[PDB]
């Protein structure tokens, strides 16, 4: 996924301000996976969290402006994301891959998800979900994810991995606008 990766990071650093890296981001990302949502949400300083950007196809409703209050993530600090792991969902309705050693654990089944966690995810429209990290120095920012509303899609390890690489670039991005 290099090349895809240079690609997306030409495109980033052809804008100046964090704004328009934000959409650019959302939307290359969108066009690489060929899906139908693409994030970036900023937590709160209680790990509650809101929808800064996004990039959509398909006729789907703009969830930027509302926010996701996670008990989870509220009462774990960050849960996974505080230790860069990614949280990656072919079908919210059969569970999670297991993600080890920085790669899939392919022994292992699929890991169901909590019904609540499965009906947030639903009232955004979401069917599919692999989600990473956005770290600004080692400071946990918020999440990047990538979406599909209509059907459950397959994710592979190197999508995951270049996904963890665009938010790497996106925490440059924001450390250096905070600078
Ligand atoms: C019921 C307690 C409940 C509500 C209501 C709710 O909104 N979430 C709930 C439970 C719950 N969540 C999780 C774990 C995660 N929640 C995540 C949320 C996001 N995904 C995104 O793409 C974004 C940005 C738009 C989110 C804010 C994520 C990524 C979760 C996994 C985190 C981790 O593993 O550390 C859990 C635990 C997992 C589960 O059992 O389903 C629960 C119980």
Same mark, same amino acid.
């Given at each position: 996924?290099?090349?895809?990766?240079?690609?997306?990071?030409?495109?980033?650093? /052809?804008?100046?301000?964090?704004?328009?890296?934000?959409?650019? $981001? $959302? /939307?290359?990302?969108?066009? #690489?996976?060929?899906?139908?949502?693409?994030?970036?949400?900023?937590?709160?300083?209680?790990?509650?969290?809101?929808?800064?950007?996004?990039?959509?196809?398909?006729?789907?409703?703009?969830?930027?402006?509302?926010?996701?209050?996670?008990?989870?993530?509220?009462?774990?600090?960050?849960?996974?994301?505080?230790?860069?792991?990614?949280?990656?969902?072919?079908?919210?309705?059969?569970?999670? $891959?297991?993600?080890?050693?920085?790669?899939?654990?392919? /022994?292992?089944?699929?890991?169901? #998800? $909590?019904?609540?966690?499965?009906?947030? #995810?639903?009232?955004?429209?979401?069917?599919?979900?692999?989600?990473?990290?956005?770290?600004?120095? /080692?400071?946990?920012?918020?999440? #990047?994810?990538?979406?599909?509303?209509?059907?459950?899609?397959?994710?592979?390890?190197?999508?995951?991995?270049?996904?963890?690489?665009?938010?790497?670039?996106?925490?440059?991005?924001?450390?250096?606008?905070?600078?």
């Amino acid at each position: 996924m290099e090349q895809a990766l240079n690609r997306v990071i030409t495109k980033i650093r /052809q804008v100046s301000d964090l704004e328009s890296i934000f959409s650019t $981001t $959302t /939307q290359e990302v969108r066009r #690489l996976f060929g899906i139908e949502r693409v994030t970036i949400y900023k937590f709160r300083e209680d790990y509650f969290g809101d929808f800064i950007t996004e990039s959509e196809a398909g006729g789907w409703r703009k969830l930027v402006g509302s926010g996701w209050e996670d008990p989870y993530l509220n009462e774990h600090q960050g849960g996974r994301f505080q230790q860069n792991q990614p949280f990656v969902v072919d079908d919210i309705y059969l569970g999670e $891959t297991i993600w080890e050693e920085g790669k899939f654990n392919l /022994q292992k089944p699929k890991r169901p #998800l $909590t019904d609540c966690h499965i009906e947030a #995810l639903e009232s955004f429209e979401v069917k599919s979900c692999a989600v990473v990290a956005i770290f600004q120095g /080692q400071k946990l920012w918020g999440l #990047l994810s990538a979406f599909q509303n209509s059907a459950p899609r397959h994710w592979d390890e190197a999508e995951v991995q270049l996904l963890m690489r665009v938010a790497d670039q996106l925490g440059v991005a924001i450390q250096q606008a905070e600078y």
